[PDB]
Design a protein around this motif. Structure first.
Motif, PDB file in Angstrom:
ATOM      1  N   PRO A 273       0.723  -1.145   0.013  1.00 50.23           N
ATOM      2  CA  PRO A 273       0.162   0.036   0.069  1.00 50.23           C
ATOM      3  C   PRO A 273       0.904   1.110  -0.083  1.00 50.23           C
ATOM      4  O   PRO A 273       0.495   2.379  -0.678  1.00 50.23           O
ATOM      5  CB  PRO A 273      -0.762  -0.275   1.201  1.00 50.23           C
ATOM      6  CG  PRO A 273      -0.718  -1.544   1.273  1.00 50.23           C
ATOM      7  CD  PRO A 273       0.152  -2.171   0.927  1.00 50.23           C
TER       8      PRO A 273
ATOM      9  N   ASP B  41       0.832   2.613 -11.341  1.00 46.80           N
ATOM     10  CA  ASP B  41       0.722   1.488 -10.786  1.00 46.80           C
ATOM     11  C   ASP B  41      -0.485   1.326  -9.815  1.00 46.80           C
ATOM     12  O   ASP B  41      -1.012  -0.090  -9.797  1.00 46.80           O
ATOM     13  CB  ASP B  41       1.883   1.140  -9.586  1.00 46.80           C
ATOM     14  CG  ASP B  41       2.027  -0.403  -9.494  1.00 46.80           C
ATOM     15  OD1 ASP B  41       1.345  -1.002  -8.887  1.00 46.80           O
ATOM     16  OD2 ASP B  41       3.142  -0.786  -9.854  1.00 46.80           O
TER      17      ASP B  41
ATOM     18  N   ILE C 240      -4.465   0.442  -9.562  1.00 48.98           N
ATOM     19  CA  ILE C 240      -5.191  -0.273 -10.456  1.00 48.98           C
ATOM     20  C   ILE C 240      -6.719   0.433 -10.220  1.00 48.98           C
ATOM     21  O   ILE C 240      -7.460   0.689 -11.384  1.00 48.98           O
ATOM     22  CB  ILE C 240      -5.495  -1.717 -10.031  1.00 48.98           C
ATOM     23  CG1 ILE C 240      -4.141  -2.342  -9.942  1.00 48.98           C
ATOM     24  CG2 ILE C 240      -6.377  -2.449 -10.871  1.00 48.98           C
ATOM     25  CD1 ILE C 240      -4.061  -3.789  -9.774  1.00 48.98           C
TER      26      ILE C 240
ATOM     27  N   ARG D 237     -11.792  -7.720   1.447  1.00 47.60           N
ATOM     28  CA  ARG D 237     -10.444  -7.546   2.141  1.00 47.60           C
ATOM     29  C   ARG D 237      -9.601  -8.277   1.023  1.00 47.60           C
ATOM     30  O   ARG D 237      -9.950  -9.246   0.162  1.00 47.60           O
ATOM     31  CB  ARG D 237     -10.193  -8.443   3.479  1.00 47.60           C
ATOM     32  CG  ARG D 237      -9.001  -7.819   4.387  1.00 47.60           C
ATOM     33  CD  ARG D 237      -8.848  -8.784   5.414  1.00 47.60           C
ATOM     34  NE  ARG D 237      -7.631  -8.501   5.922  1.00 47.60           N
ATOM     35  CZ  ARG D 237      -7.259  -9.188   6.985  1.00 47.60           C
ATOM     36  NH1 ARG D 237      -7.887  -9.913   7.758  1.00 47.60           N
ATOM     37  NH2 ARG D 237      -6.255  -8.577   7.621  1.00 47.60           N
ATOM     38  N   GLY D 238      -8.436  -7.422   0.569  1.00 51.53           N
ATOM     39  CA  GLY D 238      -7.542  -7.667  -0.410  1.00 51.53           C
ATOM     40  C   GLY D 238      -7.880  -7.133  -1.621  1.00 51.53           C
ATOM     41  O   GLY D 238      -7.009  -7.169  -2.505  1.00 51.53           O
ATOM     42  N   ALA D 239      -8.906  -6.417  -1.753  1.00 53.57           N
ATOM     43  CA  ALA D 239      -9.139  -5.628  -3.100  1.00 53.57           C
ATOM     44  C   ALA D 239      -8.319  -4.367  -3.241  1.00 53.57           C
ATOM     45  O   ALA D 239      -8.251  -3.803  -4.253  1.00 53.57           O
ATOM     46  CB  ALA D 239     -10.552  -5.266  -3.110  1.00 53.57           C
TER      47      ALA D 239
ATOM     48  N   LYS E 142      -8.279  -1.655  -0.458  1.00 51.20           N
ATOM     49  CA  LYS E 142      -8.739  -0.491   0.261  1.00 51.20           C
ATOM     50  C   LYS E 142      -7.744   0.560   0.701  1.00 51.20           C
ATOM     51  O   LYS E 142      -7.715   1.588   0.560  1.00 51.20           O
ATOM     52  CB  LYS E 142      -9.681  -0.875   1.304  1.00 51.20           C
ATOM     53  CG  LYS E 142     -11.111  -1.644   0.540  1.00 51.20           C
ATOM     54  CD  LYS E 142     -11.853  -2.284   1.747  1.00 51.20           C
ATOM     55  CE  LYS E 142     -11.056  -3.585   1.934  1.00 51.20           C
ATOM     56  NZ  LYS E 142     -11.785  -4.183   3.287  1.00 51.20           N
ATOM     57  N   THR E 143      -6.642  -0.222   1.451  1.00 50.21           N
ATOM     58  CA  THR E 143      -5.791   0.598   2.153  1.00 50.21           C
ATOM     59  C   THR E 143      -5.013   1.450   0.883  1.00 50.21           C
ATOM     60  O   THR E 143      -4.528   2.512   1.114  1.00 50.21           O
ATOM     61  CB  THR E 143      -4.743  -0.107   2.946  1.00 50.21           C
ATOM     62  OG1 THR E 143      -5.451  -0.763   3.862  1.00 50.21           O
ATOM     63  CG2 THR E 143      -3.527   0.625   3.459  1.00 50.21           C
ATOM     64  N   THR E 144      -4.439   0.727  -0.148  1.00 51.34           N
ATOM     65  CA  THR E 144      -3.609   1.360  -1.377  1.00 51.34           C
ATOM     66  C   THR E 144      -4.444   2.482  -1.807  1.00 51.34           C
ATOM     67  O   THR E 144      -4.013   3.634  -2.269  1.00 51.34           O
ATOM     68  CB  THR E 144      -3.399   0.377  -2.193  1.00 51.34           C
ATOM     69  OG1 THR E 144      -2.644  -0.885  -1.620  1.00 51.34           O
ATOM     70  CG2 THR E 144      -2.355   0.894  -3.339  1.00 51.34           C
TER      71      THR E 144
ATOM     72  N   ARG F 208      -5.044  -9.020  -3.257  1.00 56.62           N
ATOM     73  CA  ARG F 208      -3.930  -9.408  -2.488  1.00 56.62           C
ATOM     74  C   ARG F 208      -3.653 -11.098  -2.709  1.00 56.62           C
ATOM     75  O   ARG F 208      -2.428 -11.370  -3.138  1.00 56.62           O
ATOM     76  CB  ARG F 208      -3.927  -9.547  -1.007  1.00 56.62           C
ATOM     77  CG  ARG F 208      -2.868  -9.790  -0.135  1.00 56.62           C
ATOM     78  CD  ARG F 208      -3.472  -9.917   1.195  1.00 56.62           C
ATOM     79  NE  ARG F 208      -4.201  -8.806   2.102  1.00 56.62           N
ATOM     80  CZ  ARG F 208      -3.380  -7.830   2.237  1.00 56.62           C
ATOM     81  NH1 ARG F 208      -2.322  -7.664   2.186  1.00 56.62           N
ATOM     82  NH2 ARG F 208      -4.215  -6.610   2.548  1.00 56.62           N
TER      83      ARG F 208
HETATM   84  N1  LIG Z   1      -3.419  -0.360  -6.974  1.00 56.47           N
HETATM   85  C1  LIG Z   1      -2.684  -1.467  -6.897  1.00 56.47           C
HETATM   86  N2  LIG Z   1      -1.491  -1.740  -7.335  1.00 56.47           N
HETATM   87  C2  LIG Z   1      -1.047  -2.896  -7.101  1.00 56.47           C
HETATM   88  N3  LIG Z   1      -1.045  -3.815  -6.066  1.00 56.47           N
HETATM   89  C3  LIG Z   1      -2.137  -3.528  -5.383  1.00 56.47           C
HETATM   90  C4  LIG Z   1      -3.093  -2.490  -5.556  1.00 56.47           C
HETATM   91  N4  LIG Z   1      -4.062  -2.414  -4.714  1.00 56.47           N
HETATM   92  C5  LIG Z   1      -4.052  -3.391  -4.058  1.00 56.47           C
HETATM   93  N5  LIG Z   1      -2.687  -4.214  -4.567  1.00 56.47           N
HETATM   94  C6  LIG Z   1      -2.228  -5.428  -3.928  1.00 56.47           C
HETATM   95  O1  LIG Z   1      -3.153  -5.937  -3.064  1.00 56.47           O
HETATM   96  C7  LIG Z   1      -2.672  -6.023  -1.710  1.00 56.47           C
HETATM   97  C8  LIG Z   1      -3.684  -5.511  -0.624  1.00 56.47           C
HETATM   98  O2  LIG Z   1      -3.733  -4.307  -0.717  1.00 56.47           O
HETATM   99  P1  LIG Z   1      -4.365  -3.354   0.306  1.00 56.47           P
HETATM  100  O3  LIG Z   1      -3.456  -3.856   1.917  1.00 56.47           O
HETATM  101  O4  LIG Z   1      -4.070  -1.880   0.098  1.00 56.47           O
HETATM  102  O5  LIG Z   1      -5.511  -3.668   0.760  1.00 56.47           O
HETATM  103  P2  LIG Z   1      -6.732  -4.406   1.895  1.00 56.47           P
HETATM  104  O6  LIG Z   1      -6.138  -5.797   1.993  1.00 56.47           O
HETATM  105  O7  LIG Z   1      -8.139  -4.191   1.707  1.00 56.47           O
HETATM  106  O8  LIG Z   1      -6.161  -3.569   3.206  1.00 56.47           O
HETATM  107  P3  LIG Z   1      -5.754  -3.736   4.819  1.00 56.47           P
HETATM  108  O9  LIG Z   1      -4.281  -4.055   4.707  1.00 56.47           O
HETATM  109  O10 LIG Z   1      -5.987  -2.521   5.196  1.00 56.47           O
HETATM  110  O11 LIG Z   1      -6.717  -4.937   5.238  1.00 56.47           O
HETATM  111  C9  LIG Z   1      -1.444  -4.958  -1.768  1.00 56.47           C
HETATM  112  O12 LIG Z   1      -0.394  -5.495  -0.727  1.00 56.47           O
HETATM  113  C10 LIG Z   1      -0.851  -5.424  -3.099  1.00 56.47           C
HETATM  114  O13 LIG Z   1      -0.227  -6.549  -3.302  1.00 56.47           O
END
Ligand SMILES: Nc1ncnc2c1ncn2[C@@H]1O[C@H](COP(=O)(O)OP(=O)(O)OP(=O)(O)O)[C@@H](O)[C@H]1O
Lengths: 118, 830
Positions: free
Chosen positions: B12, B19, B21, B50-52, B54-56, B349
């Motif tokens: 993130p 980069d 998405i 989760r893994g979509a 969101k934090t990024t 993710r």
């Molecule tokens: N825009 C992006 N570009 C590249 N890889 C991405 C992108 N968004 C997500 N990913 C991939 O998906 C993984 C999960 O992203 P992220 O941790 O931001 O989301 P989340 O799982 O919803 O968040 P959290 O860690 O707060 O639970 C990242 O570690 C990365 O590998």
């Protein structure tokens, strides 16, 4: 109807339905000539992408079309059952029902059900 | 464009422009935030599993907003993103927001130039801070105290609060208003991260948003999964109910109305925090790249090996495609694309890690076994589904004995005993759909280039599922436990042992008029009945002299019971070819291998019942060409399923048509309307040959273009024309490219030269010959002759069957043998 528009993928779905798929009883119970044939199949597929694009299908009509179809078969199986008489073959008469008289009135069922509720 | 670098960290915080998405939503969300201020709680939500990402996504919006704050007329300042899971377990969200808001105000006051303005603003700021501190106990109290009343009545405040008493919302509202004036911004953006790590912490965020962040000068953007928020909100409405009321009103009529109220309590609680018009949904890769064609407004590429430019990227559908296609030994089509669409629906993710593991292991090999590379990635990401389903986790236990165990349990939980052995990801739960590809990789890697033990998947792995579904049937789980243990599932030492065992299982079935012609086998008689007519005598074992003696020796499967009964089946033939090919490459070893399968192997009835020197030189000649072609075999997981599906269906067709043709006299004859004990087993091996030949042309990886044609998939039953025509058409198609037959059907090519199956294809009395059917047989032999190199029977050997020396190239005694339960009373008609 759920296929491509070219000459290759049409045969993929066409040849798929030719093979009679295997089926086992559910556990809940107690116990050439095709080269030009696919063209006609693609002829209808050349239409499925040409007419229904501007349709406006609601969800009430789908059940309404099906319900008319479902009830229509419940009468075919109730009246053609007794009409398996001795000379029912080649049923030029009405009460003489063969395995096709019990069958022909099942495809007109689909045609009729897509006109009353259409 | 949007290119994913699998060697970039992909974190993130490590994501840069080009980069991201979700670039469209990052753009779209920004103006909607500004428009809500340019024009009451103003809360935006970004939904996604989760893994979509969101934090990024959520840091990009904050980063973009801070870039051009001055340019836009409305100024919005952004707090650092708050992650509720990383905060102290008891620290209030109001304290966290104020502490971060204090930092920006303090850092802005140090930027003031006028000492007159800095002194005045700082005094006002700490005036509001001292009142939050005086009221923070209200946030966290286990009890009230009358000493607080003097604080509530403490109205001698220079500043103005509209509402009397000690209201924490009014203190924070004025503090935010003060902070906007100091920072010179129209609104302040409070940003919250995901609660998916620990969703109990989301209640403090949800409660703080409605209680405190109601100001017109605050913008709240939150991420997470609305189901997880829903599961959290619903659990608190239950805590609002009186505990004792929940047991005294346990009636289903009242329980169905408390759930109705809580559903309504839950429905408007979500609606009032996150308005639907303010919601934004994070779309998955399947909704970004879409299917073939455009199918989506966002194009995403990927880097496969290091040292890339931007030009040489690969479509993520292709990258998941080739990895699935090459890893699972698939070919372009529905099956190879149904899997890819299943991976595109997984969280990003999980999708990245599967993609990243594959293409970093792959680059290690070049400084191969692509199925080994992919299975490493798939196994490493589906552990939770693998563990929950009940699969095997040990890499040392990657043996086909366990591979039959999981498949039986996989379909047991899938409840699909018809198509469950296909391993397609069509399962109701994503946990089972995740195991489907992992199991698919097991078949595509363990059974890779192994002509011996792939049939054990067909005979034990997927075979036992079919046998259990029909002939077998918590006590049901206990019944399943008895079957899985007795049938030797997970304890397989030989394919013939399962084949021997199943003959005692498929036998126990109710048949019309009780004829001992079961599924794929004929119950040979160990006794002799009087008044046996015709040239059909008892089943003589001594009459078989030569290679044909060993053909039925494996086929015979005695059963130990109160009345011992014997069976000749095609499974034992399948068991033989699996075990015989499971040997060395020396004539001494193969000679030592035959004794295992030709010996009198015997099983026992299940408890749930109420009752050849010249041949070896040819055998090694088969194996001389096996290893030259066995290493090139790449069988897909569903290919065994597709082949077995036709096989299991063909036996039912054969066991039905041939059962009623066991007439009284002259069953060999000339007509095809009468059958004997060897005619049934003639088509059983032919069915296996046909089942291998048909789907392998369609669904094999080493053969790209199908070679059957656009005809019909009619299996040979009572006639060899169906099997004959397909091979005849094959030769013409291969002539266009001058293509061979050993690599076109390696499974079928090496099932033709097998000396074990040679006797069973052309029985003396089990053959169907006619004047019009001879034109079929003259093509049945004109094609097998060329592919091998010679003819299995010479002209005199072949002509004897059509119309006096006993020879071992064909069966001699089974033709006349009687079958249990077949009373020879009614003569054959004509
Ligand atoms: N825009 C992006 N570009 C590249 N890889 C991405 C992108 N968004 C997500 N990913 C991939 O998906 C993984 C999960 O992203 P992220 O941790 O931001 O989301 P989340 O799982 O919803 O968040 P959290 O860690 O707060 O639970 C990242 O570690 C990365 O590998």
């Amino acid at each position: 109807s759920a296929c491509r528009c070219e000459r290759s993928a049409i045969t993929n779905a066409f040849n798929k339905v030719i093979a009679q798929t295997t089926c086992i009883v559910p556990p809940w119970s107690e116990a050439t000539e095709f080269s030009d044939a696919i063209t006609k199949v693609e002829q209808w597929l050349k239409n499925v992408n040409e007419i229904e694009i501007g349709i406006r299908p609601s969800a009430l009509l789908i059940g309404k079309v099906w319900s008319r179809f479902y009830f229509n078969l419940n009468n075919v199986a109730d009246q053609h059952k007794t009409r398996l008489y001795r000379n029912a073959e080649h049923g030029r008469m009405a009460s003489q029902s063969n395995a096709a008289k019990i069958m022909r009135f099942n495809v007109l069922a689909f045609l009729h059900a897509v006109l009353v509720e259409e | 464009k949007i290119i994913i670098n699998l060697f970039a960290p992909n974190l993130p915080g490590s994501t840069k422009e080009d980069d991201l998405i979700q670039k469209s939503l990052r753009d779209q969300l920004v103006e909607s935030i500004r428009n809500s201020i340019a024009y009451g709680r103003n809360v935006f939500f970004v939904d996604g599993t989760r893994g979509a990402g969101k934090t990024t996504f959520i840091n990009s919006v904050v980063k973009s907003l801070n870039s051009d704050q001055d340019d836009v007329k409305v100024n919005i300042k952004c707090l650092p993103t708050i992650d509720p899971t990383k905060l102290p377990r008891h620290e209030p969200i109001l304290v966290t927001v104020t502490a971060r808001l204090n930092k920006m105000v303090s850092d802005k006051l140090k930027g003031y130039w006028a000492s007159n303005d800095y002194r005045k603003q700082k005094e006002q700021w700490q005036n509001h801070l001292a009142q939050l501190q005086r009221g923070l106990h209200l946030l966290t109290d286990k009890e009230y105290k009358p000493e607080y009343f003097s604080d509530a009545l403490k109205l001698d405040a220079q500043l103005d609060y509209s509402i009397g008493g000690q209201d924490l919302s009014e203190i924070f509202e004025e503090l935010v208003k003060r902070a906007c004036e100091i920072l010179d911004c129209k609104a302040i953006l409070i940003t919250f991260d995901d609660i998916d790590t620990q969703f109990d912490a989301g209640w403090d965020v949800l409660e703080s948003i409605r209680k405190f962040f109601n100001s017109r000068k605050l913008v709240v953007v939150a991420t997470g999964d609305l189901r997880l928020y829903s599961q959290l909100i619903r659990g608190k409405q239950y805590e609002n109910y009186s505990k004792t009321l929940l047991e005294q009103e346990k009636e289903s009529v009242r329980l169905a109305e408390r759930g109705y109220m809580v559903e309504h309590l839950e429905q408007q609680y979500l609606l009032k925090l996150f308005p639907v018009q303010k919601r934004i949904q994070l779309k998955t890769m399947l909704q970004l790249v879409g299917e073939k064609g455009k199918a989506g407004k966002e194009e995403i590429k990927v880097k496969t090996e290091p040292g890339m430019q931007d030009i040489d990227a690969i479509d993520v559908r292709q990258a998941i495609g080739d990895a699935v296609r090459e890893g699972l030994n698939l070919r372009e089509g529905s099956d190879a694309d149904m899997y890819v669409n299943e991976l595109l629906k997984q969280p990003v993710r999980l999708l990245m890690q599967v993609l990243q593991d594959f293409y970093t292991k792959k680059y290690h090999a070049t400084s191969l076994s692509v199925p080994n590379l992919l299975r490493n990635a798939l196994y490493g990401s589906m552990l939770s589904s693998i563990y929950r389903a009940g699969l095997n986790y040990e890499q040392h236990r990657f043996g086909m004995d366990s591979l039959c165990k999981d498949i039986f349990t996989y379909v047991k939980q899938d409840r699909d005993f018809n198509t469950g052995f296909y391993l397609r990801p069509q399962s109701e739960s994503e946990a089972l759909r995740n195991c489907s590809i992992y199991l698919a990789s097991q078949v595509s890697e363990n059974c890779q280039g192994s002509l011996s033990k792939f049939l054990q998947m067909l005979l034990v792995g997927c075979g036992s599922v079919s046998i259990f579904n029909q002939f077998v049937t918590e006590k049901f789980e206990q019944l399943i436990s008895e079957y899985v243990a007795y049938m030797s599932v997970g304890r397989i030492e030989s394919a013939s042992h399962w084949a021997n065992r199943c003959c005692a299982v498929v036998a126990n079935s109710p048949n019309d008029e009780k004829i001992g012609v079961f599924l794929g086998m004929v119950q040979l008689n160990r006794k002799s009945r009087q008044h046996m007519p015709g040239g059909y005598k008892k089943f003589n074992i001594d009459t078989e002299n030569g290679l044909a003696k060993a053909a039925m020796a494996s086929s015979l499967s005695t059963v130990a019971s109160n009345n011992l009964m014997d069976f000749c089946s095609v499974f034992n033939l399948i068991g033989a070819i699996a075990d015989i090919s499971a040997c060395r490459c020396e004539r001494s070893a193969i000679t030592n291998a035959f004794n295992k399968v030709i010996a009198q192997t015997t099983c026992i009835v299940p408890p749930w019942s109420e009752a050849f020197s010249d041949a070896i030189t040819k055998v090694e000649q088969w194996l001389k060409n096996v290893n030259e072609i066995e290493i090139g075999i790449r069988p897909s997981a569903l290919l065994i399923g597709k082949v077995w599906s036709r096989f299991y269906f063909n036996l039912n067709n054969v066991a039905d048509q041939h059962k009623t043709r066991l007439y009284r006299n002259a069953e060999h004859g000339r007509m095809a309307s009468q059958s004997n004990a060897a005619k049934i087993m003639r088509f059983n091996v032919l069915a296996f040959l046909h089942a291998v030949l048909v789907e392998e042309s369609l669904y094999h990886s080493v053969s790209d273009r199908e070679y059957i044609g656009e005809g019909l998939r009619l299996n040979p039953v009572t006639s060899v024309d169906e099997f004959e025509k397909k091979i005849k058409i094959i030769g013409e198609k291969l002539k266009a490219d001058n293509k061979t037959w050993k690599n076109t059907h390696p499974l079928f090519f090496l099932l033709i030269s097998c000396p074990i199956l040679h006797p069973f294809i052309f029985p003396v009395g089990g053959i169907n010959c006619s004047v019009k059917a001879l034109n079929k047989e003259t093509s049945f032999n004109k094609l097998i002759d060329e592919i091998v190199g010679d003819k299995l029977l010479s002209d005199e050997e072949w002509d004897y069957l059509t119309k006096q020396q006993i020879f071992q190239n064909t069966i001699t005694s089974l033709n006349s043998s009687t079958i249990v339960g077949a009373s020879y009373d009614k003569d054959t008609p004509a």
